[PDB]
Amino acid sequence: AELTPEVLTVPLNSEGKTITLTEKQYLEGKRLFQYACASCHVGGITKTNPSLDLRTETLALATPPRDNIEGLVDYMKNPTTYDGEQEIAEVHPSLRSADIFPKMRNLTEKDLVAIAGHILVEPKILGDKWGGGKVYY
Amino acid sequence: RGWFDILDDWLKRDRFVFVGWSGILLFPCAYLALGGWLTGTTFVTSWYTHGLASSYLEGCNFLTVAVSTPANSMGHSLLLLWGPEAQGDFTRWCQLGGLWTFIALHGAFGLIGFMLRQFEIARLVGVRPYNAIAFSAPIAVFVSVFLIYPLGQSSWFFAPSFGVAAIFRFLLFFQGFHNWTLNPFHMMGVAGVLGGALLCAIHGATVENTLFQDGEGASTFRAFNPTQAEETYSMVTANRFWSQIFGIAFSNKRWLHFFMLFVPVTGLWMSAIGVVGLALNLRSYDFISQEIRAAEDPEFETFYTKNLLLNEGIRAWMAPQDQPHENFVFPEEVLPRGNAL
Amino acid sequence: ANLWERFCNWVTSTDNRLYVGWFGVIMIPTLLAATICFVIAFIAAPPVDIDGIREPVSGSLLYGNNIITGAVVPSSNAIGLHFYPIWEAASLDEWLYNGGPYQLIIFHFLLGASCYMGRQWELSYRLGMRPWICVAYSAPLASAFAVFLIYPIGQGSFSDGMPLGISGTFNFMIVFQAEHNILMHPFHQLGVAGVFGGALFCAMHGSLVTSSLIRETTETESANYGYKFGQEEETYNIVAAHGYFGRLIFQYASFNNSRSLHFFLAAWPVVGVWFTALGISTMAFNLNGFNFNHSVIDAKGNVINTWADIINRANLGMEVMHERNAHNFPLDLA
Amino acid sequence: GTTGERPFSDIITSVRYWVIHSITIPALFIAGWLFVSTGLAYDVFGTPRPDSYYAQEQRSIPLVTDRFEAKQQVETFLEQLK
Amino acid sequence: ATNRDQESSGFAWWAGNARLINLSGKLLGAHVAHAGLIVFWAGAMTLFELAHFIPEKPMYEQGLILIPHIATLGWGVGPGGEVVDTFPFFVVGVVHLISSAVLGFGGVYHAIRGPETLEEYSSFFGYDWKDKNKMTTILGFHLIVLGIGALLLVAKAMFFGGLYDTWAPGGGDVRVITNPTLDPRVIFGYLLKSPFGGEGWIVSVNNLEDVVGGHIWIGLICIAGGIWHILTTPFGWARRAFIWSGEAYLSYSLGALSMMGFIATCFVWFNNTVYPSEFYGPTGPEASQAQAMTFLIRDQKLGANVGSAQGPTGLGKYLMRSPTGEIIFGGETMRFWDFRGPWLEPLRGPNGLDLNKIKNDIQPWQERRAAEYMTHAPLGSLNSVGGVATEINSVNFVSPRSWLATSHFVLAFFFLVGHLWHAGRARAAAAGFEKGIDRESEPVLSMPSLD
Amino acid sequence: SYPIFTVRWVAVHTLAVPTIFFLGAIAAMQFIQR
Ligand code: CLA
Ligand code: CLA
Ligand code: CLA
Ligand code: CLA
Ligand code: HEC
Ligand SMILES: CC1=C(/C=C/C(C)=C/C=C/C(C)=C/C=C/C=C(C)/C=C/C=C(C)/C=C/C2=C(C)CCCC2(C)C)C(C)(C)CCC1
Ligand SMILES: CC1=C(/C=C/C(C)=C/C=C/C(C)=C/C=C/C=C(C)/C=C/C=C(C)/C=C/C2=C(C)CCCC2(C)C)C(C)(C)CCC1
Ligand SMILES: [Cl-]
């Protein structure tokens, strides 16, 4: 097996449009994901709230849908609870709260897209492992 | 002066590396055991037998490389290169695990050769062969662990694989499955190994700290002449020191050094016997009286019951990956787990 | 001579069957208290709530243990690192429930064993010996300090100190592997070389000196009767022993200096046990063994398991089952 | 004493030695480097390259499950990578 | 050869520095040159850290142990521990490194070129180890230098910008100390506190007032003792009590440094005042408490009543009592209830944690800090994989409290071994059997049999 | 009057020449990217 543009093609928006990533972006998103997100989201679980993982099936059922690049980029700017009812920038890192989460200050729009691509590509690679927790280590 | 006697003179020639008759067995087998481990840890996978990477070539480091055992479906086959499994194909031999039998079998005969080398050199110098006799314990350990143990089990798959963390896995398997810490034969082995290390450390330090002053320098090492007739330290002062510190002491130099042979040698032999038992799954796993009470009395808890729960966790959490030929499918909901973790 | 000087001469006297000394003045009462408390508690002590969760563990013989399963149970997790002498309890019954004997035993013992070490220096000064035997004892003493004191300090509770029992010790070792991967720690690997090599060299030295005993006895009597206590000459031939062993390997891998040989015997296991004690002591602060979990991945990104990942599956089984009622929250952070 | 060979200190310090071994040592090294760099080590020993562990959409390992049909199984696995 | 060989000095090469024992000039050079290596390392390592430093990540995610020491002193940091200006770190680094070159110059000069011994070049700098008066006088000088040093820390705190105060209201800030504690009942009460849980001996000091105060006491104590030892010579009882040799003095210092290394180990592991968690990451206890807080907050947000939730054992799932009744976090973290920290104390009332404050007064910054400290607990692997031993690779983190505590326990233990070694050897040498038993007068042979 | 070729010679070279060959192979492996 290898990293193909087929694996590297993820939903761009909720309207079924897609976008194809390069190898460089995928590894960039993994590098940046470790830098800013992995302390809580290692392997796709959420250490401070294990009830919510980063599985595509889970992101799909978030309000608004989060299983595409645009929805994931929007979450990284203005995060919400799972039903969309509350904004949580005060306790979840985002561009909107880059003052209190300083790791978010040096992130450009290009970086957030690479991060989302990683989140969306990785379960196509690891399968159940992504977001499964220690059962699948 | 036949050709036999002329060959004998050249073998027993006094050189930098002594050869002897025993060398004909020893040097080829030891070199190929050694060479086979180095070859297999450097270049050879375990993907088809185990589902694992195991070489530097694949990206493993010193602690994770291994010559892994062959697949369970090979049973106890000798896995000869010219045998019916590989049928001459060197590449297939490597993929099917033939290097494990290659290393195990050549190493077995290399150990035989090393012991004969001890007998051979002992006889030509004219000393008693107590060093050969002591080497029986490593041989007993190697034979019971790598040969007898898997011969009692379903295949070579379950013998140790030749690697650092592959051996650590073996340790934990033996805990989870055989409850080997509870076995009195292993406990005797532990006492002999820890007691041998103790005797090594206490004898060395006693000699170093009861030396006579035989030179004027601060480095006491230069004050020993291997032709001198006299004891280099004081046995009488060593004796009194331990008598008043610990209550008893050695008084006989010969008994002291025989005791240092005896203790670790007997330890390794005792642990060998317990492994022979584990070849048959003849474990000391349980105490029946404890299980009868524990089963009836939900408030009864000891460290023995606590350890079995740990063993049960090891078995279920490691078996699917550890024995892939079994196709264990354990759903989340049947994995034993405490609260929260 | 006044009474105080007479007393000092008796204390430091080299004519006592057992040397007392100034270290002995502390060592004797502290070891006696520890020993007497341990014997009574191992036979008779009631169950102890080690994990502070009102779930007592039976450790004593009278409460259904045998030699192999019996233990003096570590003190309650609710106590943590707090000092729990008898006089802090409302009753002996409360002190027993909460694991009081464990603190009493290990504090007196560590004090007495430290003075044991000191007492070894002292007598060697009175006899005119070189002083470094006590340095070799520092390796086992350091190891005892690691399991009973340092490791509880890092983790914040004497309830994670090593139990005083045969099965309790194995529990400690398993739980330790799950939480620190001690097998993958080079300081433990160094301890293993220390004691394997120690046992190896113990057997080597015993077998080589025994191989070269000088003929001093007939075939009926024991060869041990060839040595007479305090004789001036040696009873074996190190030249012959060197000659055998030099040829067994090669000439320069073999010692011919008795002093250099014996210092090697002392240095090897002591250094290795120093390291393994230092390993327990640094894992007390959660600097754990090498983590190669998912360290090899293929061109696509699939995890290619190694033997390290197999060890992790066993570790995960120990982790999730140990102290199965004591965790409410998903990470076991101490 | 001496068993009659030339002492080791004598050799490694001699000029003739390093004249011979300024070539052999680096040549063997480079030979070893080329054994891997050419990809030849993979085909001798049958070790997977990073792209030939799995097929593109398979998560099962090619475990050999038959004693006497074993060499035949590995060949079948190797041809489902292409 | 002027020593420099085993024949004339009686020491082998592997104990070659023992040749310098009675060569005061050559010994001076070793000490000054080695001092140069210490100042060199402090220099180069600060520059290394600065070169690698990214101000947007916490210090403790970056493997830094020296820049946190400079920030604690009030340089380079503003409110919350945020890095305002890195220039002071550069200055600290460059100045040490330049100094090491004049130290290194002086050491290499004294060891090679200068006089082998000093006793004929000047009776002031020369000395015999056995001169009880000269020995105490050098001690006295160095005591005075130490007490000055302690007073420098005071001057920074009181007159030259203040210190970083993690307890300062509003999340921590640099702050001038204007009322140091001088009451000896407090300053020395610390010394009489038990080292066990809930007391912590001197490791429990939790406010900068006590810290600055203690250094006024120590600074004046050292200056007094320095003068005392310059004008005095040891009394009779002290002379009969010690061994007076170069090696004994070394062994007393090895003992001292061992004890101090053990204390340091425990300071960095437990104390979050002079080792602010803003810079060093949370303490073990702190991380474990932060996890209980985190899930208390989450569940309470969902509608759980955290005060009445009974856990599986019958103890409270979120809250329980300590053995003396205080309300504390439940679960395994019950062992850590002695923890005190700026992010947690506002929820504390007279009986411990306050349910009313828990239900109503938890701010988002406390939820932020608790989540941050819980996911930066000081666990991790030797190859710097963060988390418990069973975690997968991903997070490249080991807490600096881990690095600092482990390295200094290892150092402290080896110096205890050194103390025993040189103390035993100094005793034996001064009695004259350090080289072995004398065959002609073996003492045991003149003693009665034990039995 | 020392020989150049001895049993000793054969012994040191049976080990040393594969050793260096293996070191070069392993060095090269450090540059394989997945
Ligand atoms: C580096 C620091 C240092 C060192 C190495 C010394 C070393 C010495 N001092 Mg000096 N001293 C110092 C700093 C130092 N001093 C300072 C700062 C002061 C000012 C307070 C003094 C005041 C001082 C006095 C007043 C005297 C000495 C004396 C001595 C000598 C005897 C040592 C002795 O008996 O130890 C101590 C060993 C003992 C057995 C004494 C009992 C100590 C007990 C067991 C320890 C517990 C009590 C402790 C002192 C305080 C409690 C601490 C607790 C709260 C934790 C020795 C050369 C004596 C001397 O000969 O004078 C010329 C003497 O009379 N010193
Ligand atoms: C001391 C030397 C020695 C020994 C004991 C072994 C032993 C072994 N090797 Mg190893 N091997 C050696 C040297 C040695 N090897 C060398 C130098 C090489 C390099 C080429 C190899 C390469 C090698 C490979 C590649 C393989 C082995 C394998 C084996 C095993 C199977 C052997 C077998 O069936 O032989 C069968 C042959 C005999 C038993 C010889 C029979 C002796 C004669 C013909 C009997 C007839 C005598 C006659 C009737 C009367 C004579 C009397 C006299 C007066 C003339 C066994 C463990 C196999 C293995 O490990 O499988 C996993 C394997 O695949 N070896
Ligand atoms: C940092 C540690 C340290 C220090 C400061 C010293 C210092 C000293 N040693 Mg020790 N030593 C050490 C470690 C150290 N040693 C270790 C680890 C070992 C074991 C291998 C020894 C073994 C040893 C022995 C066996 C002996 C000494 C001796 C000496 C003294 C004289 C050395 C001499 O003749 O140099 C002569 C060497 C040279 C002239 C070569 C060059 C040396 C210079 C200093 C190089 C420095 C270069 C450096 C880059 C500085 C340039 C920068 C510039 C700006 C200054 C000197 C005080 C000797 C002694 O006691 O004499 C009485 C002696 O016999 N030492
Ligand atoms: C503790 C360190 C120490 C000690 C005890 C000595 C002692 C000695 N040296 Mg050495 N030396 C040192 C460090 C040291 N030196 C350093 C660092 C250097 C490099 C700059 C030198 C370079 C050196 C040379 C080149 C020579 C000496 C000589 C001498 C002798 C006479 C010096 C004199 O009369 O000055 C008297 C005192 C003064 C003139 C006062 C100046 C001292 C400074 C400016 C005071 C500042 C102290 C400072 C504030 C403390 C903090 C510093 C640091 C902790 C941050 C004497 C044996 C001479 C000798 O033996 O003749 C052959 C000689 O030629 N030394
Ligand atoms: C700990 C402080 C966290 C950090 C660092 C990151 N995330 Fe997070 N995330 C965290 C929590 C506690 C939650 C649940 C929030 C809630 O109450 O609803 C989340 C949730 C998400 C989600 C939603 C997933 C879903 O199933 O709908 C996403 C997409 C997400 N987080 C992404 C994300 C990214 C990209 C991060 C790095 C920039 C990151 N998180 C860091 C906790 C924490
Ligand atoms: C005696 C002896 C010894 C020792 C010695 C010593 C120890 C020394 C030291 C020395 C030293 C101690 C040195 C030092 C030096 C220093 C230097 C030389 C520095 C310089 C600096 C600089 C030049 C800088 C620069 C810069 C800047 C300014 C800025 C930034 C950048 C940079 C960094 C570049 C030995 C052992 C060897 C041997 C024997 C004898
Ligand atoms: C700064 C500070 C502080 C303070 C401090 C202090 C004030 C200190 C003090 C200290 C001290 C005050 C110390 C002391 C010490 C002591 C010691 C350490 C001792 C020792 C001893 C010895 C060593 C002895 C011995 C002996 C004997 C016993 C017998 C005889 C012999 C001899 C002599 C040997 C505080 C904490 C508040 C806070 C923070 C900061
Ligand atoms: Cl448990």
Ligand SMILES: [Cl-]
């Ligand atoms: Cl918990």
Ligand SMILES: [Fe+2]
């Ligand atoms: Fe001996």
